Amino acid sequence: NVAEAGEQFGQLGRELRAQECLPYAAWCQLAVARCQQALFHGPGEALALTEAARLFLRQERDARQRLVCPAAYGEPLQAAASALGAAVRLHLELGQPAAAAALCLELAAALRDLGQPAAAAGHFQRAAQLQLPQLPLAALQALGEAASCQLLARDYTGALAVFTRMQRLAREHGSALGAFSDVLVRCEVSRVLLLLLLQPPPAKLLPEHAQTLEKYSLPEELFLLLQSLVMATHEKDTEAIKSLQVEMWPLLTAEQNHLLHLVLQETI
Amino acid sequence: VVVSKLPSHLHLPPEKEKDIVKFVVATLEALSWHLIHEQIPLSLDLQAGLDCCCLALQLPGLWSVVSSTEFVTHACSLIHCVHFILEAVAVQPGEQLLSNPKYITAACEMVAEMVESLQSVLALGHKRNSGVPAFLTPLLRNIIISLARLPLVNSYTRVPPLVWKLGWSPKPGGDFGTAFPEIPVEFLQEKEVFKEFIYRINTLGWTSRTQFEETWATLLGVLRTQINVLAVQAITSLVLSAMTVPVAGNPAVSCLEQQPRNKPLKALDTRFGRKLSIIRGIVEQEIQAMVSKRENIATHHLYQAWDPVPSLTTGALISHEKLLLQINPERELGSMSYKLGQVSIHSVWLGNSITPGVDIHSCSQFLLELYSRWILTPAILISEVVRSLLVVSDLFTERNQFELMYVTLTELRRVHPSEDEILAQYLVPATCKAAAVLGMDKAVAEPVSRLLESTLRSSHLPSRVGALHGVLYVLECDLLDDTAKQLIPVISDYLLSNLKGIAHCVNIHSQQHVLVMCATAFYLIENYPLDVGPEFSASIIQMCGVMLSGSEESTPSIIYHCALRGLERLLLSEQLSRLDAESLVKLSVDRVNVHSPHRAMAALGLMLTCMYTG
């Protein structure tokens, strides 16, 4: 009775995908998910909801990535947000957190891909909260992309908080073992640059920051140049930093170079 | 930067302009020469040269100087140096960005490849972006957009390269080497080449008005259904391309202008309030240097953050310090884009005197005639053309346009079934806006009220968003009937039942539903106080207490600044009583001490304004 209606709506959705319109095909996928919610199914309603969300984010990609249009204003963003909220709630009723975390990771990537970083960082931290016992490497990667989001949206103290949380997690699970060494290298460069960017008072200064600024007051040339850069900034010596960046440019990535340019600007 | 808002004695002299653009050529040649023969120059020297070149191509007089035929070598030098700098950051060795003399033919392809790079490489948050050091993306994005509108390359880069894949090669000449004639429309009946053409006319804007009528006539020449819906999206973008305020059409120096729906305040402009306006102007200047989104701002200078609202025939630009609370609370601070509430019906009621550089009047009339012929057809084109008229209805300067709009939308509601939520969400703000321009009579107000009362009970969430925007549009300016206001407080029960349920965890549910929801809630508190009970005001103050007392990853920063700007908008008006103000005082003195800096900044501005009402 309802399985033939679900297969009919799925055939209609595939036909509309072949026609390539894609609000209506995802609406028929919501009809599939509602008809499969009318019975007791579980994961297939989630599959219909996720495919509807894939179609909605694909249409908004076609409306802002492939077509950077001045008239578009994000309707299937809201539709995909509602559908994926229903999907992660069905996963949380089922009890499988890793799939829901993958869904929120996809939401975060599609939201960062449009020029809207704050809700992307929020959904990244939700997806990393949903993976804390199970897969800590996935939690560290979600938190690192979250840190890049909050550094895009210029919540620097949020990036400091998420970086000290990343170092706390990787120290607690890291004996470093592997890719945890890569996490520690990136976090130790960016936490030093993010401590020299906003120079905290000793009241709000957590003891972990006291440990790193005691270590400063990882590859060898980078440790030596950054230790010299902490000394040249706490000296406030301009030409020192002006000759230090030209040697420190290839040893850092792009976003760390953004942080170092922000360091060099707020001493000049 | 500073020459944009100074009196006429302090603007630049015209005789020096050749020397200034020659200096821009010189500093970009210095950047390129130092990239060649040494290591990198610096981040400061590079950002200085790119900033000076972006602002030099942002001014009208200097851009008219560089668009001459005497300085074509200088414009080619700018193209070569900027493409060389962009290829010496993001292009690793042995890769590419994405997968008559000779230098002009190199430069035109250079600018076209740079525009496709702007599609691919130089967009924020992207994967492919991750090599550019992220303090150069707005700068290089603006310098490519402002470089691709040069008269050397604009005839070339509006041609998509799928046409250069096919066999199309005429002979150009316009005293330039590249003065190509316009693309013939028989290619545009393919899908992807039309997609690249709408992308070029989107991220490029337009020029002197002849190009606008040219693209207008060819876009009407487009008018299988994918081609039709793409032409509808293109024609919405092309008519909205004349609504951008200061230089009228350039995406570099401009954005979509907006009109405030909130009234100018009464508690300001006294002998006591001017100092408070100065203090709030400093604290919100620093907030917009911290939080805001630099869509208007192309450099790193913190002293420039302006707003596109004109005077009200369009007058000059309003400076940002004069509009302390004029900006509508639906807008994230500084983002300059279409968000369904750009124009207020105040503005079209008093700009065009009706109360119950291109002629856009004829364009809008032709759009109405074409769409009324298209309505009275598959469902996709119908839903997208209702979205089209909803977007384009801001341009209309005649009440008969809105009358034919309203009768066509009521007939479309009559002929279409009710099992269409997508057409419903594109339909409801258009219908309530069409009711909003006209007088709110009985046969007007009754079906829109039944429509909003039906569509708030839907299952599709942007239908609820459009329902709240319809609630916002009907409550704006029309003196609502005493029978018409009796069907209001079901929306107050809706506000209570969907603010109590999302009191604790806010980021999980949605981002803009709760935002525009509390925005219309604050407008309902302000403009119609006696319609709803004051217990609703007390409950929404307690609910906003649950809003602001949450953790950092529970209520995000946009919701924080939205709720705080709304509560300060409530405080500046004298509509509230004293005990709600005192509860807000104890709320603010509780919430100053949170360790996040900009939340503490705006809460500090709140505790400033608490001790200035009494």
Next chain:
Amino acid sequence: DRVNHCLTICENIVAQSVRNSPEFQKLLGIAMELFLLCSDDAESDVRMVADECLNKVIKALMDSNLPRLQLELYKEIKKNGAPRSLRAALWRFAELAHLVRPQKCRPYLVNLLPCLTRTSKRPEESVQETLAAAVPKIMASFGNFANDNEIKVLLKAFIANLKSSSPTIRRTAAGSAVSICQHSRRTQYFYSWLLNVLLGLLVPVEDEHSTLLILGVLLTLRYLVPLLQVSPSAEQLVQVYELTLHHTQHQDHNVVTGALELLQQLFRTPPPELLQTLTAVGGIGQLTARIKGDIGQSTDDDSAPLVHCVRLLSASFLLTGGKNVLVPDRDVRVSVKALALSCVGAAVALHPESFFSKLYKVPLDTTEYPEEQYVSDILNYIDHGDPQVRGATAILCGTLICSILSRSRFHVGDWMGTIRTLTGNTFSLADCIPLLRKTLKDESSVTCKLACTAVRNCVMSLCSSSYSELGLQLIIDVLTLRNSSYWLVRTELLETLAEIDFRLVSFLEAKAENLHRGAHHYTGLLKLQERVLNNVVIHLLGDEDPRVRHVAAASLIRLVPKLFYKCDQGQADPVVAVARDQSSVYLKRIYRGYNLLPSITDVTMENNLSRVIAAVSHELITSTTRALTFGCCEALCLLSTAFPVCIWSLGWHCGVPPLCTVGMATMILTLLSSAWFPLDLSAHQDALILAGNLLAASAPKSLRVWPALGDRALVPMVEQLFSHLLKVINICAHVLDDVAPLGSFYHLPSYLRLHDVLKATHANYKVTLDLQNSTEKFGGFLRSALDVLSQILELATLQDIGKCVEEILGYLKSCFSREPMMATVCVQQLLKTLFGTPGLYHYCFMAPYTHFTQALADASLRLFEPLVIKALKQYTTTTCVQLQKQVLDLLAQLVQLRVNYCLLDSDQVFIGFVLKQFEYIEVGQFRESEAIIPNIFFFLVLLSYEIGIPKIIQLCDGIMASGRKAVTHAIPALQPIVHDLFVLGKELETQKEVVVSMLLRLIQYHQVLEMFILVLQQCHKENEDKWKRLSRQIADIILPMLAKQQMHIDSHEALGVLNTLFEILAPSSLRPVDMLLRSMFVTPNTMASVSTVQLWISGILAILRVLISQSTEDIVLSRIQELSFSPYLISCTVINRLRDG
């Protein structure tokens, strides 16, 4: 009506289930006859339904009544009637040829060969096609029973077809002749005989030889070349060489292609004696005692024969001897040019100096031609218009650089100086390296694939040379090409990177200064390990072809150990990394899932493996697309099978049981529980393998419902997987029992789609016929499911299975007949549970030297019986070998537990079949006697503790005294004899001395030395006098064996067991050093051959370590002083007359 007739008769056969009945046999035979009668009508649909019902009855009846089917098949093959029916019956008998028992093999052969000659004489074309398809499988199944004259008359019958005009019958006769002599009885004698016959057809070439016959004999020789690897002599091969050098200039468009095909495949995979006569200086002279100039034939001195080969080929085909010009396509064909370029490319790859030779030995006609040219315009053919010529020159320049940098030992300047003084061509290698770069950016896909193969041949010889700069440029120019419009270009790109060790590439990056800029003055690092690992291989897991995803997984497995991530706590610099890499080469019962060992483990392999699994798992979790999930599950299953998670446990650790590790079991256990992943099997079976491994790798930490698991937070995961596995197996039961639907999938609405997909693939299996198939979806899926169930069941207990054993046995009662190899191991493992059970001074000198000195310091000192009977019958009826080994291991574990032997309560015909297998092993009839015989002997010696051991010793002596090579049969036969007789009265002493004398017969092999270690370790514990006498006997036996170089200690594990024997040997046996120095100072008979020198020096090393360790300095000096050991033993003159002799 006829189609419905054959179909309902097929249904009446398959619906019987009443076998081994005579009237059933008669109706089966007449049904087989009418089935092959249904396939004779001249129409498509009736022939197709006949073919499918015949394949259905063959494959469904393959279990019970096999030889009646093949008897009827042979009875219709003997008819030689219609071409279609004979084709059908013959190819089906060829596909069923390897299912026969070896008892009835000889009657089928002696009954088959005259009809084989009859179908060989048949002139129908597609009959010859199915003949070429049929002969090799038959003679692989039937070859080793035929006597010499039968194979000789078969070969004469096939040689008699080499004069025909059709190419199909020629190719059939060629491939079938080579396929018969490949398997036959004594393959070297038949190769010499066939070279004699096929050269007797080409007795001197100054005659007419009916050029179709020339094409046929050249195709036979082209098939015969890759297999040469009395013996065939070198004069035969040099006659083959002068044959194919004469036959390049014949006037035809086909014989030149055949000759160049033979010459190219001869130079590719050459016979070694012909290779040594070809690379020689004088060469063929020692073996005998368009052209307008004197090239000089291949018999003069002072010039290698490959020089004349390259000169003749290039002057005949692809070059005009007056000017650097391309020859036109008008006179010579272009595939001729492509084959000539591949020929001369391999000829450069064997001897690179031939590319620098002047092509004309005499300067030719200075009036008409001002200059002379060398063979250097051969590399002017990249600018040729046709593809597959430019790529041929690409492969030429690639193998040219590789053969220069490996012919000379990277001393390019001295070698080029010698050649530039000898020959006059101005030529460096950076004059073809930009050309090889230019070819990689071309439009067509075939020249891109050929240039990528050129980089595969070239790049790791380049980057470790003095031209490493151009090697980096070639790596980057390859790296830009991961997204072309072909799958072969992508897999070739991705197979070039799996042969680059990135430690040397990282060293060349860090040493370089301005190559990080490259073109256009870039600034920043050039992260080739990240732009290769994270950007090419893990991203090209996301292709849609399963070819590209599978080869991407293979390239990840090869790229794990050569990555060099920066600043590991082992290798720090790159130079320490490459020094480690080269020093470790030159200078020095539970299931397969688990281990309990401490397992000392490398560190940088853990870091590279953790990094690669972090990247692959990050791509698996956030995969927006569909095919990337399959492409990452393939690569993670392959990274678990190559690198075990029980051995590399700290690589796969992701903090899940933080402190033997679980790893990423949770993401996978979600990924199976969805509804879109089990829809395809080609990654679902891989994900089952990965889930089983990642749940099994946390055994020895956790163990000390499911009460043995011990860690509660792990308990439901296994449960889910275990329950899921039973559900899967229940589905497979309902596939093989045609039944429409604890472990139960009736209510679960996701598994019904799985049952539908399995039923569709099983129908696609039952319609077509192909037995020996590796890529089989349903069978491979049942194998992977039973394998992972076996792996999980070791963690079970009797409280866990004691309420569910019967339904698992019922499921195994059905799925036995499909794949019984890995199905009986599930029964074995379930029966197990039911009864209780670093700074380059450390790496290059100091740590190996302290290993050596520490070594010297130590050196100075009850429902199973239906399945059991079914398995015994399946073993007595099969020919698949691993099934036999598994049934023997099941019987071994069953007899290890104290069960009564009521499984043969009446008879003992099982052990009679075992000894009948022993007979065919001893004569040599059995095809795969290797991997079955130690299990037979282990089963016998396990039986003996109640058949007496002297019968086993007699069978071992019968295998040894008359049989084939001992390293496959005889030694692993003796191994469980030794292990279960010494380790575990006077009759036992007599068996002991007989066994150790049998061991003494075979001392030349080193596994026998491992056995002798077990001997001396057991007898040294018991009695030291017998130990001392036995050590004296083995010492004075083993020392003249080392003196006369008749020991096979060529392997390093062989020298290792020799040194551990001389450690474990009694010191009183080597106390007089007279025999230890008489066998030390020896000189081999001929040290011209390599292996003679290797055995001589390995013996000298083996005694020199004893001279160092066990005895002191003045003792061996006095022992030399009493004897006459002249210092002129090996003078320079002695080695000169030995390398001459």
